[PDB]
Amino acid sequence: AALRPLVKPKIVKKRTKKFIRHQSDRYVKIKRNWRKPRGIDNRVRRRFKGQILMPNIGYGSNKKTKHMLPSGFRKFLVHNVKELEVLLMCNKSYCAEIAHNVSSKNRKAIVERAAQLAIRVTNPNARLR
Amino acid sequence: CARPLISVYSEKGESSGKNVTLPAVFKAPIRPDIVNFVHTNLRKNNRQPYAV
Amino acid sequence: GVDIRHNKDRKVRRKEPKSQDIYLRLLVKLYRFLARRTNSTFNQVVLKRLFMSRTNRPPLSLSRMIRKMKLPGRENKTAVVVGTITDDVRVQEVPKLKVCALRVTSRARSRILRAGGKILTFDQLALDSPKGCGTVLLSGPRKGREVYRHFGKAPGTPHSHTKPYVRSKGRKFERARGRRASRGYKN
Amino acid sequence: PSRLRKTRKLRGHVSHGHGRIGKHRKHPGGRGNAGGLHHHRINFDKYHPGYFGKVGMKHYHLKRNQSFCPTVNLDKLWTLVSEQTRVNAAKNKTGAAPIIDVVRSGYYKVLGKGKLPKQPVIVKAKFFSRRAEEKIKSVGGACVLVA
Amino acid sequence: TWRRWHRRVNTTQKRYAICSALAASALPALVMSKGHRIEEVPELPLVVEDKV
Amino acid sequence: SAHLQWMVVRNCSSFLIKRNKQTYSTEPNNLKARNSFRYNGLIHRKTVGVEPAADGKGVVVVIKRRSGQRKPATSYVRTTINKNARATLSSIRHMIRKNKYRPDLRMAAIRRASAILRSQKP
Amino acid sequence: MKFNPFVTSDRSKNRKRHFNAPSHIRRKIMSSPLSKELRQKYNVRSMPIRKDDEVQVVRGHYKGQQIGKVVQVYRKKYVIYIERVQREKANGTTVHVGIHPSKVVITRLKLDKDRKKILERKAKSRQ
Amino acid sequence: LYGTWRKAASLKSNYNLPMHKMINTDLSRILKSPEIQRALRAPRKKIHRRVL
RNA sequence: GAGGGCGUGAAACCGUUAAGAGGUAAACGGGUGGGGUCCGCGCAGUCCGCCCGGAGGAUUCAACCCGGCGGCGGGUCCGG
RNA sequence: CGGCUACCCACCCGACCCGUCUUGAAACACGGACCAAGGAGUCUAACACGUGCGCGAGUCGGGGGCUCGCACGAAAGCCGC
Ligand SMILES: [Mg+2]
Ligand SMILES: [Mg+2]
Ligand SMILES: [Mg+2]
Ligand SMILES: [Mg+2]
Ligand SMILES: [Mg+2]
Ligand SMILES: [Mg+2]
Ligand SMILES: [Mg+2]
Ligand SMILES: [Mg+2]
Ligand SMILES: [Mg+2]
Ligand SMILES: [Mg+2]
Ligand SMILES: [Mg+2]
Ligand SMILES: [Mg+2]
Ligand SMILES: [Mg+2]
Ligand SMILES: [Mg+2]
Ligand SMILES: [Mg+2]
Ligand SMILES: [Mg+2]
Ligand SMILES: [Mg+2]
Ligand SMILES: [Mg+2]
Ligand SMILES: [Mg+2]
Secondary structure (H helix, E strand, O other): OOOOOOOOOOOOOOOOOOOOOOOOOOOOOOOOOOOOOOOOOOHHHHOOOOOOOOOOHHHOOOOOOOOOOOOOOEEEEEOOHHHHHHHHOOOOOEEEEEOOOOOHHHHHHHHHHHHHHOOOEOOOOOOOO | OOOOEEEEEOOOOOEEEEEEEOOOOOOOOOOHHHHHHHHHHHHHHOOOOOOO | OOOOOOOOOOOOOOOOOOOOOHHHHHHHHHHHHHHHHOOOHHHHHHHHHHHOOOOOOOOEEHHHHHHHHHOOOOOOOEEEEOOOEEOOOOOOOOOOOEEEEOOOOHHHHHHHHHHOOEEEOHHHHHHHOOOOOOEEEEOOOOOOOOOHHHOOOOOOOOOOOOOOOOOOOOOOOOOOEOOEOOOOOOO | OHHHOHHHHOEOEOOOOOOOOOOOOOOOOOOOOOOOOOOOHHHHOOOOOOOOOOOOOOOOOOOOOOOOOOEEOOOOOOOOOOHHHHHHHOOOOOOOOOEEEHHHHOOOEEOOOOOOOOOOOEEEEOEEOHHHHHHHHHHOOEEEEOO | OOOOOOOOOOHHHHHHHHHHHHHHOOOHHHHHHHOOOOOOOOOOOOEEOOOO | OHHHHHHHHOOOOOOOEOOOOOOEOOOOOOOOOEOOOOOOOOOOOOOEEEEEOOOOOOEEEEEEOOOOOOOOOOOEEEEEEOOOOHHHHHHHHHHHHOOOOOOOOHHHHHHHHHHHHHHHOO | OOOOOOOOOOHHHHHHHHHOOOHHHHHHHOEEEEOHHHHHHHOOOEEEOOOOOEEEEOOOOOOOOOOEEEEEEEOOOOEEEEOOOOEEOOOOOEEOOOEOHHHEEEEEOOOOHHHHHHHHHHHHHHO | OOOOOOOOOOOOOOOOOOOOOOOOOOHHHHHOOHHHHOOOOOOOOOOOOOOO
């Protein structure tokens, strides 16, 4: 009930697991980021059933529903008033997102200018007094 | 490729009557990738080596 | 599976020109528009030669560009060259012919303007001939390159005439075994 | 540029572009031109014929200084002097001919080619060929030897 | 210490890059896209008097 | 030379925020945020832009003079319109339609003026 | 911009010479500005501070209208100590607060014949 | 110091202005000129999508 | 929450508290279910932008013209 | 009320521990107790091929010289009898 953007369909991602790396559970020296195994005996590379799944081209989301927030916009980050006012033309599909290093004194001015220009901000009530 | 006339400005900012024809260097072609190539090589020329 | 054949996805082709020349990209845009909108196979071949590289566009020479117009039927036609037309030290007389090429050298432009011809560029050639009527498209001596004279099935096995690599062409450098019958075998 | 290097792309692959089976260690075939006759004969032969043996006489203390004779052709014979010179010298005046000296240009021997027009000239050189001398006689010029 | 630091450029390409840079300095859109404030500035390349 | 200016400005400029998302010009004389060729206020010989007024009431319109190039102190002529949104929308419609001046980007100027008149009133 | 090639712009060399300068250099380092009426009366920008100079502090925890006489000048610590400026410890013992002499406005100098010669050289060089 | 395309540079020895690849380079003027639009096929703007 | 090897203070490992579980050694992939922390909102009550027919109010231009500067366009290529 | 998720648990099915020598590895083949930091195709010379740019029967100042002393100037500009 804030800004109510345009016609955005049922957004699907075709799987929502952000695939884990093999043997990341067994060793805590291994970060959970994916890394393609190139072993000569590895069951993950051999694609046995019951093992983990490798991320390939088939998991690509639809181009209409690509980079889509669940609210219905696409995010764009903003540092100041000029980068907020560049969103004056496409405010009904592209929302604002204030950077983390922006202080509260300028953050309240940025969110006030976004409320004037009717631009959606993802974090409206954060880092306030 | 015509050569126009650019007025000469005084110390106050008013256009003087002295008009000089624009030279052909400003009508010469513009190759920013060749500028980037020669600029890269002169930057490589413009340095002390570094520690060994 | 469906395709029992091999998978050759892209044939050979170069779609976009690899050069970052802005003027060459604008000429690629213009002749791409003419090639897809004029039904002119001349514009097709000129657009392909603009896609073609720097090396495979050899420099045309002034004597060859005279002699390909000296043939009967090429009186008022314009010699279109995708590539450079250079000076020739051999020539003595230059006719009143028209030139449409990229990057004609300074002495060549000087002698053509003294002889009374008219040099153009590709945008002026497109303004004068969209379909390319009244043009003769020329190309240069590729096989006379120094690189192509090392190329063959072998350097010397049926004597092969294909120029083995060596530092100094002369005595004591690759002239003994396999080059004469008195010292071992002979090719 | 290390960012355009194949090594930056091949990070992650185990054997790094040189195979697991063959195991390229240090120098498997030798060093340099090792085995020119024994076991690399199909690469020294069949790609460099003539590499082994003596060829002829041995000139002790040779210089590339006594055999200095840069050759000029009959095509290059005209542009050693300017075109204004030959035009204003052969613009229908008389039977006079300009002298084209190749020694001042830095060339010693005149060789024979084609493309020698009707207008005769006088060529001074230290050496000639019989074909170039016949071409000069055919176009009507004069041959002058210098030293 | 014997890395190939300094890179020679052809002088024709050096003069080509100088001519291209001086020609691109004349267009207002290029210099405004580089970011110089040319709002209230008078006519392109500015020529001042010999008293300056 | 406008196509040369576009082929130079379309990269390596002090604009064109290519930061993890779509490209924005931000282009201090512009009508749409997309860094495109048909929507560009520095390169073309004829350029249109609308901006908020400095007094806080009304919309200013900056249009290129086209009578003098390479002279940016007089190259942009400005006007200040303060009307009841329909008279000024019809005014910018007549100013773009009834002249030869930029038959393209009609809807760009109209949508930006309408959006800024919505954003200016409360 | 630095033009003489016999002086450093190096941060390490400048900090080395600054934190290892001898005492006659540290006297020039620990220089203090003057009040506006005293610089109008003497035609000089700043003077090195000594034991018997009266001091108004402009910046810090103690600021303004606190004209007092200094007692100690640790040139090892780059710190002058002022008699008026006090701070109590835990056990009720007072101690002087460390004040850097560049944040120090001198209101009264010490009269000496050597300082008259120094002030005359300052005025003659300022011209 | 550089010269026009008619004369050489008088201060430098053997420098001239470079070859200009596209003389009248207004691509919009060329593509909207009547000589080019006289020789065009037809504006084919139909889409002809997939038929179920 | 900077207390004399004292800026920031992670992992391996240990102690306590909270939640959950335990015969097939622990751990994993696909699919759901249950619980908990947290997030957005008010949960039988949440949609906007335009046009037109109705009800009160205050305004001033617009429709046509006079007055005015600035910009677009083309003809005599008029004066240069 | 809704919520996929780097939270926990249960259930059905599948699932031997990674890396490499090997024709063949889960192997009763070898290395690995765990964790943090460092850690391996670089540089020079030469050649060949491909590509990009400049000039083009020519091309190249890398060797020196010229400018007023300049932080960037150990740069850059120029030589041409
Ligand atoms: Mg295997
Ligand atoms: Mg299939
Ligand atoms: Mg395949
Ligand atoms: Mg591989
Ligand atoms: Mg091998
Ligand atoms: Mg140092
Ligand atoms: Mg600590
Ligand atoms: Mg701390
Ligand atoms: Mg600190
Ligand atoms: Mg901890
Ligand atoms: Mg418990
Ligand atoms: Mg082995
Ligand atoms: Mg075995
Ligand atoms: Mg194995
Ligand atoms: Mg064993
Ligand atoms: Mg084992
Ligand atoms: Mg072990
Ligand atoms: Mg590490
Ligand atoms: Mg090459």
